[PDB]
Amino acid sequence: ISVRGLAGVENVTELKKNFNRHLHFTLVKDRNVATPRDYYFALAHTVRDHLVGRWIRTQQHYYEKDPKRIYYLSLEFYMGRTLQNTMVNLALENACDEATYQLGLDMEELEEIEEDAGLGNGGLGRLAACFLDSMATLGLAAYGYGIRYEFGIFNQKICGGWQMEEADDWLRYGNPWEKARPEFTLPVHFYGRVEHTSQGAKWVDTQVVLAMPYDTPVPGYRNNVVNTMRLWSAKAPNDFNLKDGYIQAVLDRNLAENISRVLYPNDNFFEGKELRLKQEYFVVAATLQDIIRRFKSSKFTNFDAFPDKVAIQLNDTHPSLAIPELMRVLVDLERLDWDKAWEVTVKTCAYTNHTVIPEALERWPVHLLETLLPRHLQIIYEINQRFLNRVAAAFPGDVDRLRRMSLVEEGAVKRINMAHLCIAGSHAVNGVARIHSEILKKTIFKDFYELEPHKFQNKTNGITPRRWLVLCNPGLAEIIAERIGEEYISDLDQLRKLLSYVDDEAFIRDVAKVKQENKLKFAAYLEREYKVHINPNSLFDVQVKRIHEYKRQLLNCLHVITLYNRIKKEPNKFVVPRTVMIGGKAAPGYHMAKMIIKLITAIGDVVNHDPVVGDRLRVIFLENYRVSLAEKVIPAADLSEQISTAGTEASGTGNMKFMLNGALTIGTMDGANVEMAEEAGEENFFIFGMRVEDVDRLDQRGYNAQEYYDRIPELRQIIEQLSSGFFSPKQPDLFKDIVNMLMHHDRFKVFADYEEYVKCQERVSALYKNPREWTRMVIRNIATSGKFSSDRTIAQYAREIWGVEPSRQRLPAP
Amino acid sequence: ISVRGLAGVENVTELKKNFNRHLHFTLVKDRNVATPRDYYFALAHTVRDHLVGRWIRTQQHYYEKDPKRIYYLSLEFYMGRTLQNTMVNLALENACDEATYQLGLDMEELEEIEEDAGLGNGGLGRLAACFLDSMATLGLAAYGYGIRYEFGIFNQKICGGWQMEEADDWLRYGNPWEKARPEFTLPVHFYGRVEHTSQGAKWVDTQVVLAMPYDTPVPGYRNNVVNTMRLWSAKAPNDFNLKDGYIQAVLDRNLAENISRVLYPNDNFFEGKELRLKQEYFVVAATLQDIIRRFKSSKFTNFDAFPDKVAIQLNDTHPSLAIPELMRVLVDLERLDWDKAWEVTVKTCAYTNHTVIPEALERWPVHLLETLLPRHLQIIYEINQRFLNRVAAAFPGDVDRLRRMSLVEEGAVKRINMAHLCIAGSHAVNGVARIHSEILKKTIFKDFYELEPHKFQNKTNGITPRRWLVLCNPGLAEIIAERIGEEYISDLDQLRKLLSYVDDEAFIRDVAKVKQENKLKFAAYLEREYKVHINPNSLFDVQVKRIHEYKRQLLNCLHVITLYNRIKKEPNKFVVPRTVMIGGKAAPGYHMAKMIIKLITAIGDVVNHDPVVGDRLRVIFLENYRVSLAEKVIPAADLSEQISTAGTEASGTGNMKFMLNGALTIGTMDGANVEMAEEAGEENFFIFGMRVEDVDRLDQRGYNAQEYYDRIPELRQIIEQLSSGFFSPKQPDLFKDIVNMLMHHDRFKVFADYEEYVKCQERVSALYKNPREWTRMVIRNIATSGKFSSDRTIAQYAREIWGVEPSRQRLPAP
Ligand SMILES: O=c1[nH]cnc2c1ncn2[C@@H]1O[C@H](COP(=O)(O)O)[C@@H](O)[C@H]1O
Numbered sequence A, B: 001i002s003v004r005g006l007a008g009v010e011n012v013t014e015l016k017k018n019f020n021r022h023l024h025f026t027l028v029k030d031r032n033v034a035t036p037r038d039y040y041f042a043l044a045h046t047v048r049d050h051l052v053g054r055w056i057r058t059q060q061h062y063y064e065k066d067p068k069r070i071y072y073l074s075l076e077f078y079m080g081r082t083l084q085n086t087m088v089n090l091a092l093e094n095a096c097d098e099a100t101y102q103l104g105l106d107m108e109e110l111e112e113i114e115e116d117a118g119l120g121n122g123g124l125g126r127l128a129a130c131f132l133d134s135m136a137t138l139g140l141a142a143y144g145y146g147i148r149y150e151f152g153i154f155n156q157k158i159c160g161g162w163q164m165e166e167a168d169d170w171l172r173y174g175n176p177w178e179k180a181r182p183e184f185t186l187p188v189h190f191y192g193r194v195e196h197t198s199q200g201a202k203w204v205d206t207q208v209v210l211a212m213p214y215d216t217p218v219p220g221y222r223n224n225v226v227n228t229m230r231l232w233s234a235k236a237p238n239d240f241n242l243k244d245g246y247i248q249a250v251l252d253r254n255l256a257e258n259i260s261r262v263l264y265p266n267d268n269f270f271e272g273k274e275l276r277l278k279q280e281y282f283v284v285a286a287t288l289q290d291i292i293r294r295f296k297s298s299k300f301t302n303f304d305a306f307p308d309k310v311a312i313q314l315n316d317t318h319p320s321l322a323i324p325e326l327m328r329v330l331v332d333l334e335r336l337d338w339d340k341a342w343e344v345t346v347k348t349c350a351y352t353n354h355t356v357i358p359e360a361l362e363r364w365p366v367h368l369l370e371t372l373l374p375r376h377l378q379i380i381y382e383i384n385q386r387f388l389n390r391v392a393a394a395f396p397g398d399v400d401r402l403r404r405m406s407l408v409e410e411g412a413v414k415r416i417n418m419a420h421l422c423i424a425g426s427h428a429v430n431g432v433a434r435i436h437s438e439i440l441k442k443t444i445f446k447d448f449y450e451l452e453p454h455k456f457q458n459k460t461n462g463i464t465p466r467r468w469l470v471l472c473n474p475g476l477a478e479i480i481a482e483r484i485g486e487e488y489i490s491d492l493d494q495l496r497k498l499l500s501y502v503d504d505e506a507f508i509r510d511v512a513k514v515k516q517e518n519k520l521k522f523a524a525y526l527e528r529e530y531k532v533h534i535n536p537n538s539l540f541d542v543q544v545k546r547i548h549e550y551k552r553q554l555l556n557c558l559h560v561i562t563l564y565n566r567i568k569k570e571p572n573k574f575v576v577p578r579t580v581m582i583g584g585k586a587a588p589g590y591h592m593a594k595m596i597i598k599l600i601t602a603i604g605d606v607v608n609h610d611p612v613v614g615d616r617l618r619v620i621f622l623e624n625y626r627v628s629l630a631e632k633v634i635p636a637a638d639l640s641e642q643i644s645t646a647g648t649e650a651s652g653t654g655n656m657k658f659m660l661n662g663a664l665t666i667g668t669m670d671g672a673n674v675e676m677a678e679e680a681g682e683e684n685f686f687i688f689g690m691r692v693e694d695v696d697r698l699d700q701r702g703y704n705a706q707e708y709y710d711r712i713p714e715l716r717q718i719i720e721q722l723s724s725g726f727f728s729p730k731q732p733d734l735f736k737d738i739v740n741m742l743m744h745h746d747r748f749k750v751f752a753d754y755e756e757y758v759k760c761q762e763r764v765s766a767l768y769k770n771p772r773e774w775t776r777m778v779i780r781n782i783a784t785s786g787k788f789s790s791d792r793t794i795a796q797y798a799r800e801i802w803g804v805e806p807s808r809q810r811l812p813a814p
């Protein structure tokens, strides 16, 4: 059937009876009223059974051996479905497929019933999920810590071409993977005031909110290691939240519990709301108590060995309060002197930066911290004081450098620069792509780099080959395994061996066959769940990621309209057929992004119903783009669009997902695109547009969009089409904000890359016309994507930051 | 060990491995970190396993055979713990006791970890729970329908002698007995308006709240019948509750979900709050859709057979909206003519009245119904119109009778008398005790009784012998079974056979021994969990029920202070030692009731620390009185206090609980007290005080408390002690509200029954001094309590109201 494992005689039989056990005893149903949803749950419970045994020994093991523990703090964990991924990592896929088949059920049909765990916005949240899988696979004693939102990223609905948001009640039917642990509930404090008495400060008169943990298992790839992802849920105490109308007192509990109610749906954007700050401290305060408790047990109160036993990784600045919180505990509660406490804190903390755009930077108003976390503000001022004293001593008289490096920003309202806080309290700061890391040193954190050059590093992102290959593209994984075996699943570098089959006639035919099968399946799914046909013979041109101005979905739109206009000019001229698919969610308050989604659908309305165009060009907007949808489109894509303005996309990861699944990449020299082209050879990549230096040259000069409008008739024609209502008949001025922006305030110079972009697009169309060569280029990309596995990234974090050695050693059976 | 069943070899072994299965796979724990709470859950899950098989066949059976279905609607279900009760009804107690013993655990210690299901206030909610158990035991296709409050009756804490309320988070650790059924979620409407179009009215523009069901199994006594208790939970739709700030929209969902958040803690008191009205319609609207769906399937759309297949019992007026709601559905949706719809509604509905005190009567302001349920108000006006037309036609010219019987009350604000609505739309109205039922006919509902005498009936309350005897008093159940067998557990009348052992020397010794063992165990529990000693040789004088003015805990207080004053007058005179225990919760807004609790504790402060008193008199306030606590005190009581003012306690059930457990009763000729004395012989009962007629004579005359104050020096002395601060030194005027009330506005004439009350108390003290005779009187009470089993009550409801025949037939195994 494939290498989804063995369908053993004894195990298929065992599986079937447990499936029936759960359907009866757990679901309390009888075959005669059981629905597909019930069947999915019976299976989910049966599969979950297989890793509890391993889960218990893994955790017990870490308690015995007592290795250094890695704590990955993140406010987001974009997990997606977990049934199939668990079967894969446990080598249960074929056995379950068989058993369910014998029970007369279609496993694939049941897998589709599982709700996605959308506790993330995009890249940042998904990185965390891939990292967890890799840390488990590399046998690291790692813990994922976050918030258990009852509402994840909203579900996107398109109504009249506009995005409509609706609550993601992912817990509605229950979550068979999590295990509530009410017995480990912890208290978290808010507000109050600070008392300075005799021997130390005291945080007093605080409001208490309880943090209840929920553990979810994270199985490594076939090594019997099952790590833990602990997610905190807010609960109100039953005393003061009643003890300070009786009915009203009880109804008001849903005020303390609102803290873990919903994920903020902003991607690369900072909103200084108090509820967000509360979520950030909540996850930090609860998590740290757990970290210290575990340490106090260990084999040990000298906190001198704390950094030898603990490592906490900050996924962006969101969990940055962990620095002043670790100090508070050590100094206020444990009574360590400042200097000793600081040494410990810096040595256990490490920070990961994800972007350089200003609007994404967390700068919290002081009055907010002042009211909500009074003691933390005091600690931050003191950290700032001592840090600046270090700067002055290093750069005597550099008074401007002092104000520039301050953790405290003066002005309208004083704010705290969380990024500066993280650099100061961490022993390592890293970028997520080579170019992004360099930019950090040359620009944004230049002053900090000059002060402590040893702190700055790079750790190029990666994706897990398990979910992003074996799981979503079994067909491709099979033919690869037929030639080079299976060891590449946990050693992606081995994909290089595929280079020697680049001229192999059978392989070329096979690689091309699986991609064709994937396109047919997706084209079907399209009509199944969304309804309105596409042509599987055309080039699948797809751009899927969050809707942003910097990601330039607009630049993609300009190209689409150009293709359309050229066809209408010479209708009877042959052009390579294309189905361009654009998908992604816009943050609710991002007006421009929502305007762009309307533009996309507007273009599709015109293009898809023009008889002269026929099946040569289709514009489709992929609704509710999420992890589970990504697992479907990516394996079916031919062309991957990664066209952000050079210098704006820190790294990106979707690009990597496409490269590993047989799609060619048209993109700019941005983020990881650079290392990908470098790995496959620029000749097997479609690079275009300005490089970072060109962007800066243009900025010195000054960007004037009119110029491009004046010199390019094709561009001019498009803008006048938008301006006159060609794409919005009933509301002619509908897109005035887009045009206005493009012409007068384009921060991402869309027009500057237009000419080179369509020119480059012509080159891919030329290559698509030559199936054999297109496929050979594909093989060159796949065979060379090994570097982008999160196992490599994690192995680097482990050795260069955490001080731990990865291990591919199978844990002593289950 | 006892007749808790057989401890079979194969079954104890089977139990142990499943206990271990759940501890590992369900709880995900290992013996080395498992706590008693974990062990309780492993056992609970193991026991729950045994009734799912029976639960599924029972429900499947009803679907095949299709018998008349009984729907018991109640806003309260005071269930208490359910582990032991399930073992008992399944004959698993000894096997589980053995198995757990072999696993090295104490079953009793684990049973104490289970949280009470306190979804009730007192009598009304407990009646519903006892009824469910009896209906299951008598093999009726019955369903309990209510609301799944996440916060039940508050937990009472005494701070400085005052009651402190605190949220009852009974779901904190989970509920292993319930089964969420999200797939059967139903929509419920609120607000909106009414459109009258061509062919009928339409309820439009309504706000939708979803009702999610949770099923809990109700096992019959050893007959393999497991009925269902369906509890609705409020959930917000994910569309409009977002689709009409994005964050705020999501946080505001906890507005529609507040409907099932908390139980109103009022006992026999009406509060016209909108949230209450919402809870009442919510349970009614959701439940009826389920009833009709089930009917539409049946073996059948002629609703003529609806009453032959359905019976809905209204537990008080709380679910009264079921009448106009059934009409709305039949007329508005099914399109039946009014008259046909009304005939059907009246024939399937039946109403149970629980009290005659005005302050407990539900009279909803019209403006509230007008805004929240516009169509229901219209239907109620139309029902009223046609009903009054019936009255006028029966009593021509009786214009006053017309206004008196109206469902609509004029005045300050127009209101709807829910009780009148229930009488009009039901084919049977019943009281809960013979005297209460007569009073209804002679007083409160006299006009209605004259109009349709056939509607009025009586159904004397009862209690379940399983939980209220076998479960809480295994020692007594054992010695009874030793002489007459076990058939009495489901045939309590057989207790009469115990009359022939009334002179048996061994039995007298045994009955007295178990009571002594029960007192020792309770006296221990007291020091264990609450701490401060009592003497197990004294008379256990206990009054446990909700704190009320009509229940006269105050009359009990007067007696306690009298005993104290007599001892202080003649210290060296012998008096029978007593431990008087008073317990019960006061509704949060009931000032007087909270004042009474403070008085009780105040008396105990003086009495319990007076050296001259010694161990001859102890005053104890039983904290957090609830079902699980009742199962502890009652079996240990010698004297049961049921001293309400004649005519105010509809029936009472605690009185019955005490009679069955070997306690003697000192009470007034009120509620069921009358039938109890009638059953045991007034010579074996301590009756005192005014009878109903005496109370009325006094009212004609006019009640003047001064008189009693003037003629009784002992009474006078007590009042002056309260007035001068003898019981409240630091705050001398603390009890001025109690004294003021007692002297000027005592609606329950406490002083009128004082003299006869202490005189009667002297008689019980005299009898207690004669152990042999006290015990013989006890045997006369127990042997004669058979009539008060809920099996008798249910059998009567079944035959005289529902039209179904009970059956003690074992369902075809599990
Ligand atoms: O005091 C202890 N005795 C024995 N095992 C322990 C003890 N504390 C932790 N463990 C084991 O270590 C695992 C780790 O628990 P943690 O504290 O959540 O990391 C537990 O599930 C147990 O198997």
Ligand SMILES: O=c1[nH]cnc2c1ncn2[C@@H]1O[C@H](COP(=O)(O)O)[C@@H](O)[C@H]1O
Residues within 6 Å of the ligand: A030, A032, A033, B056, B059, B060, B063, B294
């Ligand atoms: O359409 C049907 N086919 C077969 N069994 C049914 C069907 N509807 C109900 N049942 C059975 O009847 C039980 C009663 O379900 P209820 O609708 O919740 O009362 C179900 O659990 C099934 O065993």
Ligand SMILES: *Cc1c(COP(=O)(O)O)cnc(C)c1O
Residues within 6 Å of the ligand: A121, A122, A123, A126, A544, A545, A546, A625, A626, A627, A630, A651, A652, A653, A654, A655, A657
């Ligand atoms: C991988 C992934 C992302 C990140 O994509 P980029 O193109 O790097 O912005 C976002 N969303 C989902 C659902 C993903 O799978």
Ligand SMILES: *Cc1c(COP(=O)(O)O)cnc(C)c1O
Residues within 6 Å of the ligand: B121, B122, B123, B126, B544, B545, B546, B625, B626, B627, B630, B651, B652, B653, B654, B655, B657
């Ligand atoms: C039986 C019971 C009641 C009813 O007692 P009465 O004396 O009839 O008022 C109230 N509360 C609980 C906990 C009960 O067990």
Ligand SMILES: Cn1c(=O)c2c(ncn2C)n(C)c1=O
Residues within 6 Å of the ligand: A266, A267, A268, A269, A359, A548, A587, A588, A589, A590, A591
């Ligand atoms: C101006 N703006 C927003 O207003 C915004 C956003 N992301 C979310 N929002 C609300 N981004 C990226 C942005 O540039």
Ligand SMILES: Cn1c(=O)c2c(ncn2C)n(C)c1=O
Residues within 6 Å of the ligand: B266, B267, B268, B269, B359, B548, B587, B588, B589, B590, B591
């Ligand atoms: C006056 N009053 C109340 O105010 C009250 C009550 N029960 C609850 N409350 C709040 N009762 C029985 C009562 O008589």
